[PDB]
Amino acid sequence: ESQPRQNFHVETEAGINRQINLELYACYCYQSMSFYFDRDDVALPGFTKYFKEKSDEEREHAEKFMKYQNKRGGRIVLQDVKKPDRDEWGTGLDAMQASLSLEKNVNQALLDLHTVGDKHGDKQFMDFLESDYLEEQVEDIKKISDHITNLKRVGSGLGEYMFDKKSLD
Amino acid sequence: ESQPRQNFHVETEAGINRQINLELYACYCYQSMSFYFDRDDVALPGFTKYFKEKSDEEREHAEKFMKYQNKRGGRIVLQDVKKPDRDEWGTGLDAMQASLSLEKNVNQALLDLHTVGDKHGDKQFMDFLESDYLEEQVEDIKKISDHITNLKRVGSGLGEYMFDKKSLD
Amino acid sequence: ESQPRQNFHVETEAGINRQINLELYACYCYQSMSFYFDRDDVALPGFTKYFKEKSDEEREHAEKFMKYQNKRGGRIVLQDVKKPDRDEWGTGLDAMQASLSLEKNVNQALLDLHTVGDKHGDKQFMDFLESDYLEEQVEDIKKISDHITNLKRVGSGLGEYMFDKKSLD
Amino acid sequence: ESQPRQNFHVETEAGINRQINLELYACYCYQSMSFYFDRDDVALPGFTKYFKEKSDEEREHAEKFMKYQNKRGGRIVLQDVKKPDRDEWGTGLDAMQASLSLEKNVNQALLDLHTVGDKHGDKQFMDFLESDYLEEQVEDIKKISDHITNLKRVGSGLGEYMFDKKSLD
Amino acid sequence: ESQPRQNFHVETEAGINRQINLELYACYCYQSMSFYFDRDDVALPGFTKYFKEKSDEEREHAEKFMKYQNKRGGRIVLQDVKKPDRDEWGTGLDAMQASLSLEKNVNQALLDLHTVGDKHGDKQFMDFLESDYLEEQVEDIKKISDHITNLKRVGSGLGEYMFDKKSLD
Amino acid sequence: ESQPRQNFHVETEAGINRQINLELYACYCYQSMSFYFDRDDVALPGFTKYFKEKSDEEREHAEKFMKYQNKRGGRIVLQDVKKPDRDEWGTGLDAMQASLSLEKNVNQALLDLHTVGDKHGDKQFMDFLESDYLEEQVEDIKKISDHITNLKRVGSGLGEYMFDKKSLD
Ligand SMILES: [Fe+3]
Ligand SMILES: [Fe+3]
Ligand SMILES: [Fe+3]
Ligand SMILES: [Fe+3]
Ligand SMILES: [Fe+3]
Ligand SMILES: [Fe+3]
Ligand SMILES: [Fe+3]
Ligand SMILES: [Fe+3]
Ligand SMILES: [Fe+3]
Ligand SMILES: [Fe+3]
Ligand SMILES: [Fe+3]
Ligand SMILES: [Fe+3]
C-alpha cells in the first residue's frame, strides 16, 4: 500500500480513472468540433476558438484528476479514448446542443462519482469534487443554455454570423 | 415637535412616506425584469444589466427621499412593498413598454406630491423635487421612449439581439 | 423542463424562492435601522453607515440566490416583502441586539434550506450554501456579538458616542 | 449559552479543544526536529529550516481552531502539551518518516473530528474542516511521501547533503 | 470537390489523418510518462515537467496537421487514440529510452508520409513537412540521445536525482 | 564531548534547558490570554493583539535559548509545557497584573541562571544573558507597570475600552 493512502477506497480510485477517460473524451469531442468549424465550408472563427478553448479545459479537468489520483496514493490507469460519435457537427446551434448534452452527461458522471466517495465517507474527495468540478459544471451548463436560446433567437444565415462575432468574444 | 421642523406640513411628510414606497416598488419591478432577462430561456444580458441599473437607481430615489424626510424633521414610516404585478415580462419591447408605463406613473405621483408642497407653501420641498426628481424623470421617460421606437424598428429575432448588444451599452 | 435542470428538486427551488424573500426582508430591516440612526434625535453616523452596508449586503444575498435559481434552471417567484416589525430601534445596543436576533434567524433558515438540498442529494447546492452563505453567517454572528459586548462595556451617553466613532470604522 | 452559539454541539466543542492540543503537539515535535538538525553533529540547515516552517504551520492550525472555537461560541480549554516522543530524530530520512507518520495521525484525527460534526449536522463546521484542513493534509502528506522517496533514492552521506540543498528550497 | 482543393491527392489526405492519430498517441504516451513520474513512489518532478511539455508539443503537432488538412480542403477523420503500451515507465533512463524509440517511430512515419506526397507531386506538402516537422524531429532525437548518454553517465540513485535537477531545467 | 564545547558547564547546560521550558510556558500563557480576549463576551481586540505578540516573543525567547544551547555544544532536552494556571483572565487590568507577575518570575529565573554561569566563570554566557534577555526584561516590566497604572486610571467600562484603543496600538 502507497505511502499517502488514507481513507481512500479502491472504488473511489477506480471511479477517478474512468472520469479521467470521460474528460479526455469530451476534450476530444470539442477538438473535433473546433476544427470542424475551421472547415472552409463552415468557417466560423468564433466557434472554432470557443470549442478549442473548451477542449483545452477538458484536457485540464482530466489532468487535474490524474494529479489528484497521485495525491491520494491511487494509481492512474489509462484507457483508450474513443473518437467522438460524429465526424461533423452541423450548424452553430447543432454543436451547441451537442455540447449541452455532453456537459450534462459529464455532470451526471461527476454526481455519481460523488455518491461513490460519499458511501465511503471520503470527506476530502467530496469537497474536491464540489469545489473544482460541480460548481464549474453548473456554470457551464447555464452558459451553454443561454447560447442555445440566442442561437435560436438570431436564426440562420446572418444571425448565426453575428452571434459568431458578438457572443463568442 | 422635532428640532429641524420648519414650514413642513404633515401632508407633505405623509406624501413623502408613500412616494418612498412607490420608488421601492419601482425598484422591485426592475429587479424582477432584470432577472427575468437572465433566465436561460430569455438570456438577453444587456436587458439584464440595464434593468439592474434602473432597479439600483430607484432604490437611490427611495433612500434620498428617506434622507430628505429626516432632514426636514419628519419621520420615515415604511410599508410592505408589494410584489410586481407580473412574474414574467415578455419580449424586450414588452418590458420597455411596461417600463415606460411605470415611469410615467412615478412621474405623475411626483407631480402630485409637488402639488401638495405647493399648497402648503413648502418652497424648499418644491425645488428639491424639481432638482432631484422632475428633471431626471423627463430625461428617463424620453430615453425609454427612444428605446421603444428602436425596439420596434429592429424587430424580433436578430433585431432584438442586436439592440441588446448595440443600444444597451 | 428547462435546459439546465439536473439533480434540482422542486422543493429546493421553492426553498430558494422563500430564502430570496427572507433576504429582502433582512435588507429592508437594515435599511430601516440605517435611516433611524440618521434621525436628528438619534444622529449616530457610524450606526447609520454600518446598517446601510448590511442592508446592501442583504440585497446582494437575495440577488445571488436569484442568479443561482436561474443558473440551476429554477424560476424566480417573488413575494411581498413585509415592512420590518419596528418603526424605531432604540439605542445602538438595542439595534445591534435586534440585528443579532435577525441574523441568527437567517442562519437557521439557511441551515433548514441546507437540510432540504441534502435530503434530495443536491451536492452542488449544499456546497453553494456552505461556500457563499454559511461561513459568512458565522463570521457575521460573531462580529455582532463582539459589538453587543462592547456596547454594554462602554455604557450610555459618551460610551455609545465613542463606540460609534471607534468601532464602526 | 453564548451569544453566537447556534447548531454547535458540545461534542464538537470538546472535539475542537482536543484537536487544538493535537496541533500544538505536532508544532512542538517539529520545533524539536528543527533544532535537532541544528546540532553541530547533525548540521543540516535545509532540514532545520523545513521543520521550523512545519512547526510554525502547526502553530497556525492550532490558533485557527482557537479562533474558530470562539467564532462558534465554544470555550477554549487548553491542556498540557506533552514533550515529543524522541529527543533526537536520526537521519534526514528518519525525521521525514516520523513526519509522515505524524501527519497521517493528524489527518485521521481531523477525519474523526469531521465525523463528530457530521453526526450533529454541523454543516458549517464540516465545510470549515474540508476547506482549511483536509485539503492541506492531503497536500502535505503527498509532499512528505515525495521527500521519503527521494531521500531513499539519494542514499546517505553525499546524497543526504545534496537533498538538503536541492529539494529543501 | 471542396473550394481549396488543388494538387491534393486522397492518399495524402488519408496519410495526414493517420499521422494525426499517431501524434495524438504520442501525446497520450508522454502524458502518461509525465504523471508516472508524479507518483509518490517515483517523484522525479523534472521528468514530470519534461514529459508534460513533450505531451503538449505532440498535441500541437496533431492540431497543426488538422489545421493543414482543412487548409488544403481535405476532411479530418479522427480514430480512437489507443492507451499507451505501458502503465508505468521504470527509471528515468527507461522512460528516456522509450521516448527515443517513440520519436524515431514518428520520424519514420513522417518520412513515409513525405514519400507519399513526393510520388503525387505535392510540392507544398513536402515543404510543409520538411519545415514544420522533419527539422524538429532531427533536433529532438539528438537531444533525447544526449539525455540517455547522460542518464547512463550519472548512474542510478543520487545520479538520477542530479540529472533531474541539472539537465531537466 | 561535542566539538564546540569549551568553558561550558553541565549545570549551565541544564539551566538553559529549564529556562527554555519556562519561556515556552510563558508563550503558552500569553497565547491563552490572547484568545480569551477574543471571546465574544470579552471582545477586547487590542488585548488580543497585544498578547498574541507577547506570546510570539516568548516563543522567540525559547528558540534563541535553543539556538544557543546548540552553539555552545550542549544538547536540548524538552519537557512537557504545562497548561497555564488559569482558563480565563478577568478584566484587562487583571490580565496585565498576571502579565507583570509572570514577567517578574521569568526575570528572577534569568537572574538565577546568570548566577549559575557566574559561579562557573562562563563569561560569554553571562554577556549573552545580559545582552539578549536581562535588558529586554527590564524594558518590558516597566512597560507593563505603566499599563497597570493607566488601566487603574481609566477605570472600568469606557475607560477600559478606550485603553484598548489608544494604549494598545
Ligand atoms: Fe469537464
Ligand atoms: Fe465543462
Ligand atoms: Fe424613481
Ligand atoms: Fe427612473
Ligand atoms: Fe443574508
Ligand atoms: Fe449577514
Ligand atoms: Fe495540522
Ligand atoms: Fe500538516
Ligand atoms: Fe510529433
Ligand atoms: Fe517530439
Ligand atoms: Fe516578554
Ligand atoms: Fe521571555
The secondary structure of chain A, three-state, reads CCCCCCCCCHHHHHHHHHHHHHHHHHHHHHHHHHHHHCCCCCCCHHHHHHHHHHHHHHHHHHHHHHHHHHHCCCCCCCCCECCCCCCCCCCHHHHHHHHHHHHHHHHHHHHHHHHHHHHCCCHHHHHHHHHHHHHHHHHHHHHHHHHHHHHHHHCCCHHHHHHHHHCCC
Question: In terms of Cα–Cα distance, which of D92, E126, A111 is closest to C125?
Answer: A111
Are the C-beta atoms of residues A112 and A88 closer than 8 Å to each other?
no
Q: Could you tell me if B57 lies within 8 Å of chain C, comparing CB atoms?
A: no
Q: For F39, which DSSP code?
A: S
Interface test with C, best of A107, A118, A125, A134 (most C CBs within 10 A): A134
Quick one: cell of B123?
418652497
Q: Which residues of D75-86 are buried (b: 16+ CB within 10 A; e: fewer)?
A: ebbbeebebbee
Q: Could you tell me if A70 lies within 8 Å of chain C, comparing CB atoms?
A: no
* Gyration radius (Cα) of chain F, Å: 18
C41 is in an annotated binding site: no
Let me know if A34 is exposed, middle or buried by CB neighbors in 10 A (0-12, 13-18, 19+).
Answer: buried
Quick one: cell of C10?
422542486
Are the C-beta atoms of residues B41 and A149 closer than 8 Å to each other?
yes
Quick one: cell of A67?
494529479
Q: How far apart are CA E74 and CA C167, in angstroms?
A: 72
> Taking CB atoms and an 8 Å cutoff, what residues of chain C touch D127?
127, 130-131, 134-135
Q: Do D142 and E41 touch (CB under 8 A)?
A: no
DSSP string covering F61-110: HHHHHHHHHHHTT-------BPPPS-S---SHHHHHHHHHHHHHHHHHHH
Distance separating the N- and C-terminal Cα atoms of chain E: 49
Q: Which ligand is nearest to the CA of C26?
A: 5
Helix spans in chain C (H):
10-36, 45-71, 92-119, 123-129, 135-154, 158-166
Q: What is the CA E101 to chain-centroid distance, rounded?
A: 10
Q: How far apart are CA D141 and CA A71, in angstroms?
A: 8
Q: Do D6 and C149 touch (CB under 8 A)?
A: no
Residue F69's contacts (CB-CB under 8 Å, 6 or more residues apart) are: D35, F13, F16, F17, F20, F75, F76
Are the C-beta atoms of residues D69 and D56 closer than 8 Å to each other?
no
Q: Could you tell me if F35 lies within 8 Å of chain D, comparing CB atoms?
A: yes
Are the C-beta atoms of residues A99 and A33 closer than 8 Å to each other?
yes
Residue B98's contacts (CB-CB under 8 Å, 6 or more residues apart) are: B29, B33, B86, B89
How many C-beta atoms lie closer than 10 Å to residue B47's C-beta? 24
Q: In chain F, after which residues is the C-to-N distance over 2.5 Å, breaking the chain?
A: none
A136 is in an annotated binding site: yes
Are the C-beta atoms of residues E163 and E146 closer than 8 Å to each other?
no
Residue E122's beta-bridge partner residues? none
Are the C-beta atoms of residues A40 and E75 closer than 8 Å to each other?
no
- Measured in residues, chain E has a length of 169
Distance separating the N- and C-terminal Cα atoms of chain B: 49
Q: How far is E37 from chain A (nearest CA, A)?
A: 10
Cα F67 to Cα B65, D47, D54, E13, F75, distances in angstroms? 68, 15, 17, 73, 10
Q: How far apart are CA B18 and CA B110, in angstroms?
A: 11
Q: How far apart are CA E107 and CA E137, in angstroms?
A: 6
C60 is in an annotated binding site: no
Q: Could you tell me if A71 lies within 8 Å of chain D, comparing CB atoms?
A: yes
Nearest CA in chain E to D158: E158
Sequence spans of domains, chain A: 10-167
Cα–ligand 3 centroid distance for B109 (angstroms): 10
Q: Do D124 and C138 touch (CB under 8 A)?
A: yes
Nearest by CB to residue A127, choosing from D104, D107, D134, is: D134
Q: Could you tell me if C162 lies within 8 Å of chain F, comparing CB atoms?
A: yes
Name the 3-class secondary structure at E81. strand
Q: For E82, which DSSP code?
A: P
- Three-state SS annotation for C136-160: HHHHHHHHHHHHHHHHHHHCCCHHH
Q: How far apart are CA C48 and CA F91, in angstroms?
A: 31
State which amino acid sits at residue A20: I
Looking up cell 487548553 gives: D78
Q: How far apart are CA B147 and CA B144, in angstroms?
A: 5
In this structure, what are the phi and psi dihedrals at residue E8, rounded to the nearest 5 degrees? -120, 100
Let me know if D169 is exposed, middle or buried by CB neighbors in 10 A (0-12, 13-18, 19+).
Answer: exposed
> Taking CB atoms and an 8 Å cutoff, what residues of chain A touch E31?
63, 66
Q: Do chains D and E touch (3 or more CB pairs under 8 A)?
A: yes
Q: How far apart are CA C103 and CA D71, in angstroms?
A: 15
- Three-state SS annotation for chain D: CCCCCCCCCHHHHHHHHHHHHHHHHHHHHHHHHHHHCCCCCCCCHHHHHHHHHHHHHHHHHHHHHHHHHHHHCCCCCCCCECCCCCCCCCCHHHHHHHHHHHHHHHHHHHHHHHHHHHHCCCHHHHHHHHHHHHHHHHHHHHHHHHHHHHHHHHCCCHHHHHHHHHCCC
State which amino acid sits at residue F167: S
Are the C-beta atoms of residues B83 and C78 closer than 8 Å to each other?
yes
Quick one: cell of A144?
451553454
Q: Do F161 and C145 touch (CB under 8 A)?
A: no
Angle between helices E158-166 and D135-154 (to 10 degrees): 120
Q: How many CA atoms lie within 13 A of F105 on its CB side?
A: 10
Residue D81's beta-bridge partner residues? F81
Looking up cell 499599563 gives: F147
Angle between helices E158-166 and E92-119 (to 10 degrees): 50
Are the C-beta atoms of residues C106 and C50 closer than 8 Å to each other?
no
Q: How far is D70 from chain A (nearest CA, A)?
A: 24
- Three-state SS annotation for chain B: CCCCCCCCCHHHHHHHHHHHHHHHHHHHHHHHHHHHCCCCCCCCHHHHHHHHHHHHHHHHHHHHHHHHHHHCCCCCCCCCECCCCCCCCCCHHHHHHHHHHHHHHHHHHHHHHHHHHHHCCCHHHHHHHHHHHHHHHHHHHHHHHHHHHHHHHHCCCHHHHHHHHHCCC
Q: Could you tell me if E165 lies within 8 Å of chain D, comparing CB atoms?
A: yes
Q: What is the resolution of this structure in A?
A: 2.4
Which CATH class for the F10-167 domain? mainly alpha
Residue F45's contacts (CB-CB under 8 Å, 6 or more residues apart) are: C146, F37, F38, F164
In this structure, what are the phi and psi dihedrals at residue C167, rounded to the nearest 5 degrees? -105, -20
Nearest by CB to residue D138, choosing from A71, A121, A126, is: A71
Q: How far apart are CA C66 and CA C74, in angstroms?
A: 9
Q: How far apart are CA D90 and CA D135, in angstroms?
A: 29
Cα–ligand 4 centroid distance for B26 (angstroms): 8
Residues with CB under 5 A from ligand 5 (ion): C 23, 61
Q: Do A123 and D131 touch (CB under 8 A)?
A: no
Q: How far is B34 from chain A (nearest CA, A)?
A: 15
Q: Could you tell me if D142 lies within 8 Å of chain E, comparing CB atoms?
A: yes
Chains that touch A (3 or more CB pairs under 8 A): B, C, D, E
Q: How far apart are CA A120 and CA A123, in angstroms?
A: 8
| Method by which the coordinates were obtained | X-ray
Cα F134 to Cα C53, F13, F71, F128, distances in angstroms? 50, 18, 20, 9
Q: Which residues of B49-65 are buried (b: 16+ CB within 10 A; e: fewer)?
A: bbbbebbbbbbebbbeb
Q: How far apart are CA A123 and CA D111, in angstroms?
A: 8
Q: Could you tell me if C75 lies within 8 Å of chain B, comparing CB atoms?
A: yes
Quick one: cell of C114?
441546507
Name the 3-class secondary structure at C164. helix
Cα D36 to Cα A30, B81, F15, distances in angstroms? 55, 70, 19
Q: How far apart are CA B95 and CA B33, in angstroms?
A: 7
Are the C-beta atoms of residues C2 and B37 closer than 8 Å to each other?
no
Q: How far apart are CA D54 and CA D60, in angstroms?
A: 10
Are the C-beta atoms of residues F15 and F113 closer than 8 Å to each other?
yes
Q: Do D40 and F2 touch (CB under 8 A)?
A: yes
State which amino acid sits at residue F90: G
Q: How far apart are CA C28 and CA A4, in angstroms?
A: 52
Q: Which of left, alpha, beta for D2 (phi over 0: left; psi -120 to 50: alpha)?
A: beta
Cα angle A20-A21-A24, degrees, rounded to a multiple of 5: 90
Quick one: cell of D114?
469531521
Q: How far apart are CA C124 and CA C8, in angstroms?
A: 10
E88 is in an annotated binding site: no
Interface test with B, best of A103, A140, A143, A146 (most B CBs within 10 A): A146
Name the 3-class secondary structure at C81. strand
Looking up cell 465554544 gives: D74
State which amino acid sits at residue F135: E
CA dihedral D135→D137→D142→D147, nearest 10 degrees, is: 140
Cα A44 to Cα A37, A38, A140, D148, distances in angstroms? 5, 7, 21, 53
Q: Do F40 and D75 touch (CB under 8 A)?
A: no
Q: What is the CA E41 to chain-centroid distance, rounded?
A: 27
Cα–ligand 9 centroid distance for E140 (angstroms): 10
- Measured in residues, chain A has a length of 169
Q: Do A126 and D129 touch (CB under 8 A)?
A: no
State which amino acid sits at residue C101: S
Cα angle A129-A132-A134, degrees, rounded to a multiple of 5: 60
Q: How far is E60 from chain A (nearest CA, A)?
A: 12
Interface C-F: count of C-beta contacts within 8 A: 33
Interface test with A, best of D102, D134, D152 (most A CBs within 10 A): D134
CA dihedral C140→C146→C151→C153, nearest 10 degrees, is: 180
> Taking CB atoms and an 8 Å cutoff, what residues of chain D touch F36?
76
Chain C from 95 to 134: CB within 8 A of any D CB:
100, 104, 107-108, 111, 114-115, 126-127, 129-131, 134
Q: How far apart are CA D61 and CA D26, in angstroms?
A: 10
Interface test with A, best of E18, E57, E71, E78 (most A CBs within 10 A): E78
Cα–ligand 12 centroid distance for F58 (angstroms): 5
Answer positive or negative: Cα dihedral of B6, B10, B11, B15: positive
Q: How far is D162 from chain A (nearest CA, A)?
A: 23
Longest dimension (CA), chain B: 61
Are the C-beta atoms of residues D124 and D71 closer than 8 Å to each other?
no
Let me know if E139 is exposed, middle or buried by CB neighbors in 10 A (0-12, 13-18, 19+).
Answer: exposed
Answer positive or negative: Cα dihedral of A11, A12, A16, A18: positive
How many C-beta atoms lie closer than 10 Å to residue C161's C-beta? 16
Let me know if D164 is exposed, middle or buried by CB neighbors in 10 A (0-12, 13-18, 19+).
Answer: buried
Quick one: cell of A169?
468574444
Are the C-beta atoms of residues A119 and A64 closer than 8 Å to each other?
no
Q: Do C35 and B82 touch (CB under 8 A)?
A: no
DSSP string covering C118-141: HHTT-HHHHHHHIIIIIHHHHHHH
> Taking CB atoms and an 8 Å cutoff, what residues of chain A touch E73?
40
